[PDB]
Amino acid sequence: TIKEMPQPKTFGELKNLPLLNTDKPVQALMKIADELGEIFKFEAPGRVTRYLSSQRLIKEACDESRFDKNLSQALKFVRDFAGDGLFTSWTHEKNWKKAHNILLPSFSQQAMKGYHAMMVDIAVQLVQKWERLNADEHIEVPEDMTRLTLDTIGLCGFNYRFNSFYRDQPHPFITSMVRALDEAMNKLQRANPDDPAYDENKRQFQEDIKVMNDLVDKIIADRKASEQSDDLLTHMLNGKDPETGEPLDDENIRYQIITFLIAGHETVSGWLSFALYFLVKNPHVLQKAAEEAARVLVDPVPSYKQVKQLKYVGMVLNEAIRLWPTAPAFSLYAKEDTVLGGEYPLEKGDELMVLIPQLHRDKTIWGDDVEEFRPERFENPSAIPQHAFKPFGNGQRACIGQQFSLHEATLVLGMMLKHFDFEDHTNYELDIKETLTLKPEGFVVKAKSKKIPLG
Amino acid sequence: IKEMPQPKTFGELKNLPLLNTDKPVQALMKIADELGEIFKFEAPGRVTRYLSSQRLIKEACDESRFDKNLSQALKFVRDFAGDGLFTSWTHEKNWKKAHNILLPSFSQQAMKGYHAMMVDIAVQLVQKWERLNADEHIEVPEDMTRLTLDTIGLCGFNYRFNSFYRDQPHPFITSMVRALDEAMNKLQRANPDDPAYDENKRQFQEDIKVMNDLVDKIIADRKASSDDLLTHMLNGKDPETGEPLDDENIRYQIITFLIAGHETVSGWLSFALYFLVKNPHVLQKAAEEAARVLVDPVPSYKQVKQLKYVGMVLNEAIRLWPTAPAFSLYAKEDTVLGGEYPLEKGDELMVLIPQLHRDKTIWGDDVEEFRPERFENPSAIPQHAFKPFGNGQRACIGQQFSLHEATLVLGMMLKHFDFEDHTNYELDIKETLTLKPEGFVVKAKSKKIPL
Amino acid sequence: IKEMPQPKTFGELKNLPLLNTDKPVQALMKIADELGEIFKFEAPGRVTRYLSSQRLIKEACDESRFDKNLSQALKFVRDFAGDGLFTSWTHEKNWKKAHNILLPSFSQQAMKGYHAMMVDIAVQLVQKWERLNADEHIEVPEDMTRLTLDTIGLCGFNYRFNSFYRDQPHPFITSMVRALDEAMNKLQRANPDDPAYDENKRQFQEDIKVMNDLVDKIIADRKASEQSDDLLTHMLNGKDPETGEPLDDENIRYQIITFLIAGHETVSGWLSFALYFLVKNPHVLQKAAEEAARVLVDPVPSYKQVKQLKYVGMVLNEAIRLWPTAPAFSLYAKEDTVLGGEYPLEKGDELMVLIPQLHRDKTIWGDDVEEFRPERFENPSAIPQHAFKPFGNGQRACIGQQFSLHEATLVLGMMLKHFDFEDHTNYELDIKETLTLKPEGFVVKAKSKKIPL
Amino acid sequence: TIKEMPQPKTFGELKNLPLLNTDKPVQALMKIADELGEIFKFEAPGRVTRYLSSQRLIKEACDESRFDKNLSQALKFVRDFAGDGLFTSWTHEKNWKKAHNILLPSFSQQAMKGYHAMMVDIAVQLVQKWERLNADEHIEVPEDMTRLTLDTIGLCGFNYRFNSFYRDQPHPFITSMVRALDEAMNKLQRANPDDPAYDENKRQFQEDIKVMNDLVDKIIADRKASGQSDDLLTHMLNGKDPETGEPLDDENIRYQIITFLIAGHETVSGWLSFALYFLVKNPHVLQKAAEEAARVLVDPVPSYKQVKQLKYVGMVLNEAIRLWPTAPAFSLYAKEDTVLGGEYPLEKGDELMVLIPQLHRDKTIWGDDVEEFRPERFENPSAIPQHAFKPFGNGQRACIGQQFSLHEATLVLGMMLKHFDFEDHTNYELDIKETLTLKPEGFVVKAKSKKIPL
Numbered sequence A: 001t002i003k004e005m006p007q008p009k010t011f012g013e014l015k016n017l018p019l020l021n022t023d024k025p026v027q028a029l030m031k032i033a034d035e036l037g038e039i040f041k042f043e044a045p046g047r048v049t050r051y052l053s054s055q056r057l058i059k060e061a062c063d064e065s066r067f068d069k070n071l072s073q074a075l076k077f078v079r080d081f082a083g084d085g086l087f088t089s090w091t092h093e094k095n096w097k098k099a100h101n102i103l104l105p106s107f108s109q110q111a112m113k114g115y116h117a118m119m120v121d122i123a124v125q126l127v128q129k130w131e132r133l134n135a136d137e138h139i140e141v142p143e144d145m146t147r148l149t150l151d152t153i154g155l156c157g158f159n160y161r162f163n164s165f166y167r168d169q170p171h172p173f174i175t176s177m178v179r180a181l182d183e184a185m186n187k188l189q190r191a192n193p194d195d196p197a198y199d200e201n202k203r204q205f206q207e208d209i210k211v212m213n214d215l216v217d218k219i220i221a222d223r224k225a226s227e228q229s230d231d232l233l234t235h236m237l238n239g240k241d242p243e244t245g246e247p248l249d250d251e252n253i254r255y256q257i258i259t260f261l262i263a264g265h266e267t268v269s270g271w272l273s274f275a276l277y278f279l280v281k282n283p284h285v286l287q288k289a290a291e292e293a294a295r296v297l298v299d300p301v302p303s304y305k306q307v308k309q310l311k312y313v314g315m316v317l318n319e320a321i322r323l324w325p326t327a328p329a330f331s332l333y334a335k336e337d338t339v340l341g342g343e344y345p346l347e348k349g350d351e352l353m354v355l356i357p358q359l360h361r362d363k364t365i366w367g368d369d370v371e372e373f374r375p376e377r378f379e380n381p382s383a384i385p386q387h388a389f390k391p392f393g394n395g396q397r398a399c400i401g402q403q404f405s406l407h408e409a410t411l412v413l414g415m416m417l418k419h420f421d422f423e424d425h426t427n428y429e430l431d432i433k434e435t436l437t438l439k440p441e442g443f444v445v446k447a448k449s450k451k452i453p454l455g
Numbered sequence B: 001i002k003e004m005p006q007p008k009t010f011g012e013l014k015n016l017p018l019l020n021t022d023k024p025v026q027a028l029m030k031i032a033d034e035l036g037e038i039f040k041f042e043a044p045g046r047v048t049r050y051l052s053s054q055r056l057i058k059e060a061c062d063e064s065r066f067d068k069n070l071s072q073a074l075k076f077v078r079d080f081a082g083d084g085l086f087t088s089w090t091h092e093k094n095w096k097k098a099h100n101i102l103l104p105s106f107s108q109q110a111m112k113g114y115h116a117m118m119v120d121i122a123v124q125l126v127q128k129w130e131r132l133n134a135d136e137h138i139e140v141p142e143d144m145t146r147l148t149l150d151t152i153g154l155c156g157f158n159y160r161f162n163s164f165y166r167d168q169p170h171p172f173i174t175s176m177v178r179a180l181d182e183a184m185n186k187l188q189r190a191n192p193d194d195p196a197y198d199e200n201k202r203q204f205q206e207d208i209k210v211m212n213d214l215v216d217k218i219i220a221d222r223k224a225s226s227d228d229l230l231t232h233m234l235n236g237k238d239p240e241t242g243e244p245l246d247d248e249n250i251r252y253q254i255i256t257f258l259i260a261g262h263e264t265v266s267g268w269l270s271f272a273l274y275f276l277v278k279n280p281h282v283l284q285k286a287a288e289e290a291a292r293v294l295v296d297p298v299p300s301y302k303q304v305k306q307l308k309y310v311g312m313v314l315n316e317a318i319r320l321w322p323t324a325p326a327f328s329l330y331a332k333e334d335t336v337l338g339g340e341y342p343l344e345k346g347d348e349l350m351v352l353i354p355q356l357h358r359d360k361t362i363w364g365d366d367v368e369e370f371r372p373e374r375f376e377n378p379s380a381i382p383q384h385a386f387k388p389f390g391n392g393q394r395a396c397i398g399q400q401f402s403l404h405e406a407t408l409v410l411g412m413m414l415k416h417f418d419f420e421d422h423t424n425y426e427l428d429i430k431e432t433l434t435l436k437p438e439g440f441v442v443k444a445k446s447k448k449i450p451l
Numbered sequence C: 001i002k003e004m005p006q007p008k009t010f011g012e013l014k015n016l017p018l019l020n021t022d023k024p025v026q027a028l029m030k031i032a033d034e035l036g037e038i039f040k041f042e043a044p045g046r047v048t049r050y051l052s053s054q055r056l057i058k059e060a061c062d063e064s065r066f067d068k069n070l071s072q073a074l075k076f077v078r079d080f081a082g083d084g085l086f087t088s089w090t091h092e093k094n095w096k097k098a099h100n101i102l103l104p105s106f107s108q109q110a111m112k113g114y115h116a117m118m119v120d121i122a123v124q125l126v127q128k129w130e131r132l133n134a135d136e137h138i139e140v141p142e143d144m145t146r147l148t149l150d151t152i153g154l155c156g157f158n159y160r161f162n163s164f165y166r167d168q169p170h171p172f173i174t175s176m177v178r179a180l181d182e183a184m185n186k187l188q189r190a191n192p193d194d195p196a197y198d199e200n201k202r203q204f205q206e207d208i209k210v211m212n213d214l215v216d217k218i219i220a221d222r223k224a225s226e227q228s229d230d231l232l233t234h235m236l237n238g239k240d241p242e243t244g245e246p247l248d249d250e251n252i253r254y255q256i257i258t259f260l261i262a263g264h265e266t267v268s269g270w271l272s273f274a275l276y277f278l279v280k281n282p283h284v285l286q287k288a289a290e291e292a293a294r295v296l297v298d299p300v301p302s303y304k305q306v307k308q309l310k311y312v313g314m315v316l317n318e319a320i321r322l323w324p325t326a327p328a329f330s331l332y333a334k335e336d337t338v339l340g341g342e343y344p345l346e347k348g349d350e351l352m353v354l355i356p357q358l359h360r361d362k363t364i365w366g367d368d369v370e371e372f373r374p375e376r377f378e379n380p381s382a383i384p385q386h387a388f389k390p391f392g393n394g395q396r397a398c399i400g401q402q403f404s405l406h407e408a409t410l411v412l413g414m415m416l417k418h419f420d421f422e423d424h425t426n427y428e429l430d431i432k433e434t435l436t437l438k439p440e441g442f443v444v445k446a447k448s449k450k451i452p453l
Numbered sequence D: 001t002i003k004e005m006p007q008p009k010t011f012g013e014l015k016n017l018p019l020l021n022t023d024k025p026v027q028a029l030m031k032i033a034d035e036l037g038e039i040f041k042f043e044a045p046g047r048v049t050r051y052l053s054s055q056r057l058i059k060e061a062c063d064e065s066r067f068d069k070n071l072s073q074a075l076k077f078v079r080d081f082a083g084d085g086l087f088t089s090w091t092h093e094k095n096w097k098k099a100h101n102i103l104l105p106s107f108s109q110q111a112m113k114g115y116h117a118m119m120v121d122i123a124v125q126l127v128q129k130w131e132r133l134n135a136d137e138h139i140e141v142p143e144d145m146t147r148l149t150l151d152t153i154g155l156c157g158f159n160y161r162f163n164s165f166y167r168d169q170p171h172p173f174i175t176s177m178v179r180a181l182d183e184a185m186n187k188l189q190r191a192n193p194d195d196p197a198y199d200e201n202k203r204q205f206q207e208d209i210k211v212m213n214d215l216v217d218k219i220i221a222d223r224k225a226s227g228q229s230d231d232l233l234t235h236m237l238n239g240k241d242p243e244t245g246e247p248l249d250d251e252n253i254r255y256q257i258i259t260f261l262i263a264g265h266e267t268v269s270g271w272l273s274f275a276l277y278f279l280v281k282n283p284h285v286l287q288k289a290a291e292e293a294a295r296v297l298v299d300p301v302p303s304y305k306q307v308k309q310l311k312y313v314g315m316v317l318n319e320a321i322r323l324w325p326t327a328p329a330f331s332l333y334a335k336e337d338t339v340l341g342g343e344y345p346l347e348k349g350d351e352l353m354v355l356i357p358q359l360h361r362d363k364t365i366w367g368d369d370v371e372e373f374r375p376e377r378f379e380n381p382s383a384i385p386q387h388a389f390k391p392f393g394n395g396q397r398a399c400i401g402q403q404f405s406l407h408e409a410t411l412v413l414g415m416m417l418k419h420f421d422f423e424d425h426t427n428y429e430l431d432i433k434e435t436l437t438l439k440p441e442g443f444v445v446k447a448k449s450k451k452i453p454l
Ligand code: FDE
Pocket: A069, A086, A087, A100, A259, A260, A263, A264, A265, A267, A268, A271, A326, A327, A329, A330, A331, A390, A391, A392, A393, A394, A396, A397, A398, A399, A400, A401, A402, A404, A405
């Protein structure tokens, strides 16, 4: 039963790297999975990793005693500006435990009720923008969602106002970040790491990290003086670690600011953009979700309890994140020598990559309609098998903002369904842009206001 | 000293799932385009390297470093072709023995003797088309298999297959086609002892008995009551040993010449005729030369040699779709290929002829265009760039025979008929181990020229 | 072994002041005449070496040691041509990808399909000149851009620019010349980030949006129904034989820009120069009109007839020899090497082939390099390798080389069949430089030979 | 992340220099590198340099367009008697290119075939010395390796016989040379170089230069009264500069003799002593290497082709030089302003130090057994990353005698294995002497003759 592993086409000494010379490597890795099956080895000069696609092996890989979160080659490149932050640190690094234990209070159900007022602030700015568009104008979905998601993490997390809705081009922070993340991804597919074309890029990459830092330094200075708040930033500057009694390193706080601004708005914006794309393509689920939102949101502004009662909006959001997980992959390594699936041996340190979009299209778990957008699959949250739905990672290195994300998207998805009717006037054909995360590109809509007031 | 590209592997099956199609040669071409001039191809128990460039092929065609290898494909046809000229190792007792006995039959001097018999078959083909009614059409590769099988029969063994007296194919042809398909299907077969293939084994033996049944028929018909290729098989003595051929090898040599001596020629004329009806200016230029040179009721031996543009058409056809699409080599001694690839003694190479003939560095960016005028001066062409007939001492013994036949027949077709591609035929290339267009059909308007 | 010559230096600005003219290529041609076959040219951050002799150019055209480079000029054009065929590095994914799918659009078989569309544009030019009143004259480079732009539009994208229905140039060409001239003027700027160039940056971006508003017009008019078999079909539907994929939406956008520009701008300059040499060299003009009268026996010329205008092509070859409308191409050193056995080069060092200077090497062409003698091109086989390089070199040579010559012959053939041309002004040749070359203010008068169409 | 650079404890106006107030600085900087990571700045009165330890940054520093070889304060002190010779000259100095192009012919694998005969001479003297020991005696490894490596460079390079095996104390040349090298290192720590404490050392340094020059005069004169030869010394006197036609300065020619006598024997003996240390400590690799040696060395004297065929022998030598690179460091500076690792900016001219033993101890490259001597690391030589194994420097200023050194070390180590079994009768505990190179100190073994004739 110990069998050898499939492997895609190899190009001499470059091994499989030429296959990653595309603008959409994750959809390219998905296509490789369909041709090679549940698992295949991917070799590049110096690196070797195995890609997992079935719950059968992914449930086995998620045993935290045998496998631990690995920094994929992608995360090492994101680490050049996020450093030893919660996302790009090793589990055994002193700043992971230290930072994890200090910042977890900020995402407790106790913390969420304080954030709700501020999330409604930005949510009203987006509705107010859409109510003030003229009849001929349209809406750029991912651009207005990035306005909303970035402004939200700034106000709830750091009491800093990017004021993105007063900008008609993207915010200067997001442009440098987007280019830095695109650089991170292109460094993966990069053959010569000194070729004449790639010398300028480190000039631009250096310029783009400085712009991002000139902002976090602006956040720290804007706090130093201008006060009274118990934010995520308050725990960062003042929180001591219960296990060691220490506050965060000065260098770590700046690395943490970068982490939460990036990881805390980039993937949520894709989620909302994908979620809204699926609704506009399935008008029965859209009308059913629009009448739940009409039912629960009876005040001019939504309350915290009302958001938790949008069960169908939550099922819509989950079915969206099932098909296109905006954080599309996470990695593990082999703590010790072991056999995976009783067929594949691993030496200690071997790297595994979870393909969340491939896992979420496993026929063995989801059935025949895996490519259909059926929010009705999430009426049985308990009936869903173990390790079959993992858009938020696994285990102790899972996404800390999972409840924060769900609350923000539901609130915002709720008010849009309550306040607008949406037309797919272009018959948008889905084109999924890939930085390291996923979002629909050039997706546009028109929104007829139902002229329901705010406050 | 570079590492070699390799297509997707499927664990213990390696690359074998990739050639699990009915058309393996065209699949290796699509892999050559993705992986380049050379790639490794592993199947359980076998490993071979496929070459695509003149640069590397010119080194593989070096007779001191590489020798003819029996690819896995030829090892399977050896179940009925045995140690005949095609399926023998060069060092086998029967190779040079048969080679030395049979080569006299392909001199430009036996060829003149064959011409009368080629015209016989060639006139039967014209007459079949001239007797078609107005709505009828021609199944091209089927009528070509009629002609070439009859021709190697009459010239080689003084035996009449009478293929034009048959509406269905000839029973020998049916068994030969099934055996060649089995040989090709065995290459891609995962578990070969599975019950799915049990009928195939009993049919494969039934088809060998049929081919041998006709070989008994051919030999007895000669014991009954010439100086042809069969006279030499029975009567020739090898100058090196003074002994004639074993009766077991004789049967294998007849099988070889009946197969290799009509299957590739039938595909060739069908491809040549395909490109002509697809390129009407080349067709008028060729039909004008046949009108010019062929002034008698039947063409003479000298006149065929004067069909120079017709010969260029045939050469340009066989460049694009060489009907024997590959030949195999092994290493013989440890060597380095092209200065980057080390090879151990015995390692196997396969020449992908359709790919070599598509080398833009040799033929230009119009490699897929049908321009017979590239062969206005064949001596200008690099060596080892055009290999439709193999290489070296194991090259095709009958290429002067084929070219003479293909010219003779193509010349008379262009002289006596106008050809309409009345169906807008879309090229579909069927693979046994050889290549042919499959459903290729046309209509033929007779020029009402007597014979 | 020999130090390399360099012209006068100006402090920290190095040689940059020397090209602060409207005609930088003609200024470099002059520097080459004093400094010889190769000289080094320094700018504040960059260094380049200019080659002028066939002796050194044959080595630069050696692809094992040198590959195509993006000069500072092309790096600036890459700001609106992007990843297109012209401004891509050969080691970029999109080059080989776009080359393999678009190369078929220029195979001889396609020329026969384009030929009908090419004739459409040319007939419009003939009848435009036939409808001029007696006192009026002809602006040569102005009507030639009308023709080549409309031709690449019809042959490439099935899009009608309708330039002959236009006042002054089309908005694309009007916007493109500013974008190309901005690119040329950025080469003289000591410090670009200076505030004085904000009007220039604003105007440069405003012109980029205009050109894209037209590629978007072309794409939208196509996917609104679509069985054409043109170059744009291959951009949208063809898949790359090596990778199995088709082109990016982003890249198809970059190639449309690429082909509209380089595919009419150098052709228009070519034809204007040929007509200059014809009206200035009345012996060659009569021989060219006597052949055109001979071969063009039909109301419209056929593909077969244009391929037989041998002397007309020889004029075109001698025109582009003297004034290659794309005046230079750039190369860099794959790895450390010695050029000419005399000058060592580090890996990546930049070379520039000065094409008008290469074509004036008296050691190759003889002592009459300035004479317009079409008969050097009678048996092209005598021409030494790498002495006549108007279309670039190697795998990065001009892709539309056959497309252009055929278009140029067809139009030049018909003008000569239908007209005698008077150089009524004694035009003194003035070479305007965008990044390409064209004669500026060339005018002629044309008396119709009154032959119908 | 455009970071600030770590730096060990500072001591006011002495900066970080007090931390290098040891007789073994490289192992002390190794101790700091392990504590501070891939890079740290090191300040002394007037000097500052940044030390690199990871292949990640060393891959960037070995880029010849961005960084060029620098003469560290250590090499500037060796310049006091080696001058403008190949080792202590700047790349942009006129003599470097000149002397480099004329002497590079002397290290051609065709020139190697000429040396094989002469290298065998000295190597035979080593075996015969050990075959003539009485039973109780033992072998002092680094003294006999230096006896051999010096004899090899003298006979092969200059046709001069030190006859180091016909003496039982070190050669008069070697003692002053070693004192000159120790002096150069010790100047790197002086809180004030004009204190009277150093006055004897300043006279000894001049005394040691005069003796080395007194021998350099003997090697040129003994050739004056001969021809002939076509050795390394012939190329120095007669070789013309290919670009300018000038021969070497007779004041440069002397510096070049000094250079090759030092660099061409000092690191080779340290290598052989280390290689022999690891064999005698890893007894099964010793048996695997002796079997290969018995198999390949079938004649009384070894041939050139046979040395190239001692494939495992080369693997042992390589793992030796990986663990303890006998030239432990080389220095670089910043041609132009650039950013190192995308985190550390550098001004033009700022200096870097590549710490070879730490580079050869990177877990990212060699795995989790980086401290174990597994010669099987060097079987697929292409499987080693680039700029991961740099015992011979980098680029155009890499060690010119690389193929020369390996041919000696392989040849001599081959004959030792063929003719002797080695007993580590003391369980020697490794103590690393540091001049400017590395050698094991007091390393001793006893050798039983395998009684194979010569
Ligand atoms: C704020 C925020 C928000 C959010 C959201 C989200 C969404 C929508 C999606 C997601 C996801 C995710 N995440 Fe998320 N998020 C966040 C966050 C985070 C953090 C901090 C992290 C890391 C943690 C630790 O490790 O400690 C994550 C995390 C995460 C993950 C995992 C990673 C790995 O590699 O393992 C995933 C898959 N996230 N996410």
